[PDB]
Amino acid sequence: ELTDGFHLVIDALKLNGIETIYNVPGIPITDLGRLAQAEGLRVISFRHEQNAGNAAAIAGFLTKKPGICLTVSAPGFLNGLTALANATTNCFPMILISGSSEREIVDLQQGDYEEMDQLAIAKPLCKAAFRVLHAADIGIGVARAIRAAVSGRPGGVYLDLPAKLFSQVIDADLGARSLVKVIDAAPAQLPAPAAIARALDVLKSAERPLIILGKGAAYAQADEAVRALVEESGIPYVPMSMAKGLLPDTHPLSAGAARSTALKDSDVVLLVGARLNWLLSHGKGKTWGEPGSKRFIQIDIEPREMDSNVEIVAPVVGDIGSCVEALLDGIRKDWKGAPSNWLETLRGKREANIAKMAPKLMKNSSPMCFHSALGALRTVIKERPDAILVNEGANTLDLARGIIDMYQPRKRLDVGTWGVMGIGMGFAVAAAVETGKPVLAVEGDSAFGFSGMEVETICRYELPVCIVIFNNNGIYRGTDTDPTGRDPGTTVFVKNSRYDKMMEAFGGVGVNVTTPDELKRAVDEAMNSGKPTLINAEIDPAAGSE
Amino acid sequence: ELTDGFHLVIDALKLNGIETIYNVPGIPITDLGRLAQAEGLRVISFRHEQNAGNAAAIAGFLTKKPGICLTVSAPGFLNGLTALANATTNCFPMILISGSSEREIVDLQQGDYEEMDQLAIAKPLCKAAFRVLHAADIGIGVARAIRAAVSGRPGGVYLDLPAKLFSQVIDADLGARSLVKVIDAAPAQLPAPAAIARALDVLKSAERPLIILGKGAAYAQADEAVRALVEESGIPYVPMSMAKGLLPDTHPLSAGAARSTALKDSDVVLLVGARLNWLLSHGKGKTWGEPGSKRFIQIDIEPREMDSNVEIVAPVVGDIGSCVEALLDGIRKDWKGAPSNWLETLRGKREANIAKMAPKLMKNSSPMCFHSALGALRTVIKERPDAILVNEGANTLDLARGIIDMYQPRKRLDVGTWGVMGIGMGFAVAAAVETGKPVLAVEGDSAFGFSGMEVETICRYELPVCIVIFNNNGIYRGTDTDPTGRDPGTTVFVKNSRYDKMMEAFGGVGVNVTTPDELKRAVDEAMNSGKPTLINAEIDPAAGSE
Amino acid sequence: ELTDGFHLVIDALKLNGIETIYNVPGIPITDLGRLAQAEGLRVISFRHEQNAGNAAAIAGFLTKKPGICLTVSAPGFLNGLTALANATTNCFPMILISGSSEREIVDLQQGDYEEMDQLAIAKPLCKAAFRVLHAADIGIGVARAIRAAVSGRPGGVYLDLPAKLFSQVIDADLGARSLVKVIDAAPAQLPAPAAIARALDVLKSAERPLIILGKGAAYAQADEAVRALVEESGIPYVPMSMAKGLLPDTHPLSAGAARSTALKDSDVVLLVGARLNWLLSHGKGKTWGEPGSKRFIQIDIEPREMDSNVEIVAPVVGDIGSCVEALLDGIRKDWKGAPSNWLETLRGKREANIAKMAPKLMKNSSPMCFHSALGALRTVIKERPDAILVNEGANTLDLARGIIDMYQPRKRLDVGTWGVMGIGMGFAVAAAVETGKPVLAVEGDSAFGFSGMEVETICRYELPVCIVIFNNNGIYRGTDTDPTGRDPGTTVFVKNSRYDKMMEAFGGVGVNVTTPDELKRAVDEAMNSGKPTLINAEIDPAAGSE
Ligand SMILES: Nc1ncnc2c1ncn2[C@@H]1O[C@H](COP(=O)(O)OP(=O)(O)O)[C@@H](O)[C@H]1O
Ligand SMILES: Nc1ncnc2c1ncn2[C@@H]1O[C@H](COP(=O)(O)OP(=O)(O)O)[C@@H](O)[C@H]1O
Ligand SMILES: Nc1ncnc2c1ncn2[C@@H]1O[C@H](COP(=O)(O)OP(=O)(O)O)[C@@H](O)[C@H]1O
Ligand SMILES: Cc1ncc(C[n+]2csc(CCOP(=O)(O)OP(=O)(O)O)c2C)c(N)n1
Ligand SMILES: Cc1ncc(C[n+]2csc(CCOP(=O)(O)OP(=O)(O)O)c2C)c(N)n1
Ligand SMILES: Cc1ncc(C[n+]2csc(CCOP(=O)(O)OP(=O)(O)O)c2C)c(N)n1
Ligand SMILES: [Mg+2]
Ligand SMILES: [Mg+2]
Ligand SMILES: [Mg+2]
């Protein structure tokens, strides 16, 4: 009996638990995707590889298994590579699998069809990259790519399959023996007791301790241990954007609504899978109070992240589950409690800030402003705490992050570390496919334009996605003009563009709403029915910042 | 009070325990090296940066602290980068620090003095690379370089210091607060009990178990735990080249002299800091018996090393110290012992091969052969078990590895994973500088030519190095000729070259020997006196392999 | 009849005029070098690939045909790559040919012998790179490499030959038809008449015109046209270092001895194969007088060199031969003459500077200084105007460049654009091999250490090289000390090292000299006899600058 490279690739993926392939067909991988579908894998075909890649990336975040993006050679590979780079930047496990052309023609730069040394091009832009020349090495190649994607700091891996590989024929028994079911692809890594003891001694010296939960903490799926660490220590916490919901955002220990005071006045800060990068002002400047006022404890699987920005006095290296559980054990044995004055200081700021926002969510101005629209969507998420929220834009992003409380972990998927516009539709597809939950995508109209053709994809697979476009006719605002009076302003779109009518062009439901009540009712009907829906919400073009 | 970039660099290195800088002076780092020496660091200046880089590399292997190599820009940086890449390949911790030119001129490719984007050029060839533009970030830049060099799988890191950096002046108190004394640069990483349990179950099922000790196990400096694992399990072991001496090479559990049988007939193999790369035939082929006859347990800090070549049924990820002690604990609690007939099989094969070799060591040919010369040096090392052996060549390498038993760990420094000719004199310098031990460098005459100029360096610092050149007039052999009769053959050197005269050029002792007894007496005199010595040993040009 | 990869490689090289291979043997190219020698090519084997690479680089400068450097994989390839990058920086045609390992193992990063994707690693560091997978494409691969090396701006090209290539067998007639004898490898490129007209108009407007001859003009081998352009226009000229001797350095139109005045006070400058890089202060600052005082005409084959640093009002793009001849034809038809007052100004400045230098050449100090030693060697070169001068160091370089007049083109080979220490012995080998001329290598003692082992290569091939080491015991000077009193100073060597004894080690002539008369006598004897000779010249350790 004989097998070929086509079947070995699919067999290796199936053996290792891959159930979905995100892709765009074409030479030389169309028949690979057809075979994947015939062998029971779900194959999702997109309108652009970048969106297939974004889907695979967030599938990795949601599941701790590498999402698979399959593309053609050079131009399609480059489209996927952009998403793979973003996956690496965000620590999402993902494998970009791409066909490539004739090795000897490419090696001589003779102008092959879609010629590119895709292995060499990918390496500066992703965590690891491999190329498989022989059918008998497909099993090990897939194993190397899975291990690179999910171990250590997870990230994007490139796997290059030359067209010639797929049609190679080898003995079927030799083939099956060549496959590898990876054992312990993402091993636990436990910290040394001395590192835990040092972290505990710093934490116990704190007068104003603070926990910061990053999306690495959400990714780790150690929800019970993270919640117990916060609740049994009594230490207030601030969630980063995609750690919202790991503990309910309304939790009594959250200082999220008092973030400025917590960051400025704390003295010991425990970072749980959160980098001191631009989102935390690099641990420097007035955001963190006076220089010398902060000691940092940091839990991270990547030892090289310690001392990346400022001195880390108590580095704790290992997987978050192991590290949090070791810390929690120590707190259970010896911990005085968190200082009461500090908690009361933060509770007062939290209540004052919430009270200041509260009237803004109720103001019923016409045109609808960002606050009143998002006040309605806040209620949707409270009523549907298992729904997934996709969110991108500028005002649409920053205001939604502050106003919409999340209640369950890994339900908020947004622009991430690189602040990428364009993840929305790819993320919505993967969220619906991987979780089976309803998806609410809250999109700026500029952000939506980077991936908006994928609404046809959403319709084609009848995915339960409700898209809300905050249509303010522009980037940030819709009011800029050309001072020469000849063209539109550089930051505007066609006024009152009807994105809902675009959705209807592919058979989805389109709604045009102009009030918070209309928005609420339309979202409710979409999420109750599961029908692909796009709601075009008129937002005041002068509202928001900038 | 004010400080400057010059002083901040030296302060940051001193703060983190750097005591030695290997370098070659020149613009823009001559004054940096002078200040290091003025501030009490030992500064070793070489004749070529590649040798200064090799010294730093093996200094990292010997100490588990990054060896520091300091170079000028573009051409000197490239010389050091070749050694940094070799350090990375061998998992040796090392920091290449280079000056670079004017950022704005290099960025526009205008033809600066020694113009090169050294940061961009280094990244494909080493583990990590950083460039420091502002004096206040020197402390963090040094901290990042240190952590990347020694954590995880150790390797070579590039630290780029533009010439303008050194002259920047900042407040001395701000300068001091910006320095970082790295906490736990190389953290312990402990494996999960489930992974150890899996490995123990495989090991207990073995009828013919084998331990392979790689140079990762030697580097880890967990000597007592590694020896206890071998001795208390009773499992025979094979040491890779630079793991020789971790346990005495004459240890009764060593199957090193029955290596071929041990690899072929074992059923369970425990790899301890050793890769299934070309040195172990990729775990494939006749070296390892019949396909499917082997189950591998592998201990390694790098999770991505698992399944690199063949399926690893029991991966154990962590630092070697933590993992071998966890295994040892499990063996102590439940171990039936290694099967006796397996040890008997290997012991018989070991004694038979040692006997086959014994007559070759005493046969006193004329001219001297490799075996009889190396028989004298075997005795030297047996009599001086704390001396360091540097070794490179072809016959001179492979025959010395088999004939010269090592008795203490980390005393054998050789060509390593890339089989590099050229590490000899650099390794000898760092060995002598770092340890204070006598050094015996056993060098092929071709191998020696790659770094031979550094005998002046050895003389200049009065280092206790005894160099033995196995002078067979060529690469592998001295007999090849030009079939056209016009030139020397491509693989020979000047016949009867007297490298001892080259040593005397720099005030060292130079000796010419023709017999094993003359060799033994000359080596004894050199190593007793500690004077820099080069012994030119006349070896039969027709002796050896090839 | 059948042929193989080994033979096709040698056949392709022979077909295109390759007569010499510089190399270091080893797997997988030892048998390739043997076959080359058996088929009549001269094969020069070095002690380190970087020196073989330097030889190939200057062979390209000397001959306008790519020098061939042949190396093993990863570590030897990296050594050669450093010289290939330097060739690219200096615009020297060169091909680095390296063996590489098993493509499928390297592509999976499984740890092949000397594993490296050398194609991908080479590309950021040279002009072009190709890899040849199939024997039938060897002919085209060699054609591609030759064309890339010598066309456009010449430079270094990497040609990768996997080990499996050499033993492929194909039909001998197919093999013969697959070979390519390159037609017009370095085509002439003629400038548009309108660019020449523009340049002539600027030149005719000049009150103080100046020609600058760079080593591109020397490389071009348009000697008669360049000399005619200078002599028939009557415009004074300044030669860059390796354009010295294109016209005799004593030529009445040379302003080389009045360089500062020529650059500062000229108004129109004609660059002929010379970049406004660091060697010409980027066309900025006080070197060039007041801002706005200069108009540049530039002749270069590389259109992208125009406006690299400052605005070029008359760019002329093409090969120097064609462009100089087109300028010359314009001058012959209509030219008023260079203003004779400007020539008078430069003549007076030249005569004053030479008179200020004359006493220092005759000052018979003890110990010998740089000036009195170089005064002797100035006379040597005057008496031997066909000899080749290799020169490197700091004081030994800068003072020799000023003091030693060259009389014939392409006789001065030095550190070049990157200021590399280490080109000396490789350049000397290639000069002697390619030209058959006597070679005088004037070497700093620090500079010599970077390639000094190759004196054995010089002896092995009995090359007419006379090496003079300016032994001042250190870098720039020999007087620096360790302020802690523990070690030698960072910039010194063993005091009164006898490098001449190192030459005796390999059967060459060693001489120690202390006065200019002893030096002159020793050089005369060495260059008269053609015997490989190294003269150790004692230089005052406090003389010179820096
Ligand atoms: N399973 C894990 N265990 C430990 N650390 C992890 C794990 N997964 C990701 N990380 C770390 O979590 C961090 C996430 O940082 P960031 O992406 O900056 O989160 P946010 O943007 O929420 O701050 C990264 O440093 C990554 O190494
Ligand atoms: N402290 C350590 N703990 C665990 N593994 C280590 C440690 N230091 C190095 N290693 C691993 O040891 C291995 C060395 O393998 P190799 O260099 O191939 O040794 P040899 O050449 O002797 O087989 C590498 O896989 C490296 O990741
Ligand atoms: N045959 C040629 N015809 C025209 N320009 C050439 C030719 N060969 C080299 N060049 C140019 O000559 C210049 C040499 O510049 P440089 O190397 O800076 O010379 P120097 O260092 O003497 O100034 C380069 O710009 C290169 O493109
Ligand atoms: C790929 C990419 N391109 C451009 C940007 C810059 N950018 C930041 S926010 C934004 C759009 C903001 O407008 P919108 O989504 O309509 O949100 P609004 O503020 O109007 O609610 C853009 C284009 C980006 N982050 N990513
Ligand atoms: C940098 C580098 N260049 C070339 C080689 C190829 N090579 C392998 S062994 C060797 C020298 C073997 O000759 P020698 O050192 O004299 O040992 P012998 O067998 O003669 O005792 C060389 C050049 C290499 N491994 N590394
Ligand atoms: C590869 C490389 N490394 C380092 C340097 C820095 N450098 C510039 S000149 C010089 C040596 C100067 O000393 P020497 O050759 O003895 O000449 P001297 O002034 O003493 O005559 C060095 C090492 C360089 N140019 N290239
Ligand atoms: Mg908008
Ligand atoms: Mg030899
Ligand atoms: Mg000197």
Numbering used by the authors:
A (entry chain D), B (entry chain B), C (entry chain A): 22 to 567
From the paper:
To gain insights into the specific active site topology of MeOXC, we solved the crystal structure of the enzyme at a resolution of 1.9 Å. Overall, the structure is very similar to that of OfOXC root-mean-square deviation (rmsd = 0.425 Å for 7230 aligned atoms). To increase the GCS activity of MeOXC, we sought to systematically alter the active site around the ThDP cofactor with ISM. Based on the crystal structure, we identified eight residues in the proximity of the ThDP cofactor as targets: I48, Y134, E135, A415, Y497, E567, S568, and I571. However, the catalytic efficiency of MeOXC with formaldehyde (kcat/KM = 2 M–1s–1) is far below that of RuHACL, which is the best performing HACL known to date (kcat/KM = 110 M–1s–1). Additionally, the KM for both substrates is extremely high (formaldehyde: 100 mM and formyl-CoA: 3 mM). In the first round of ISM (R1), libraries of positions 48 and 571 contained only variants with reduced activity, suggesting that the isoleucines in both of these positions are critical for catalysis.
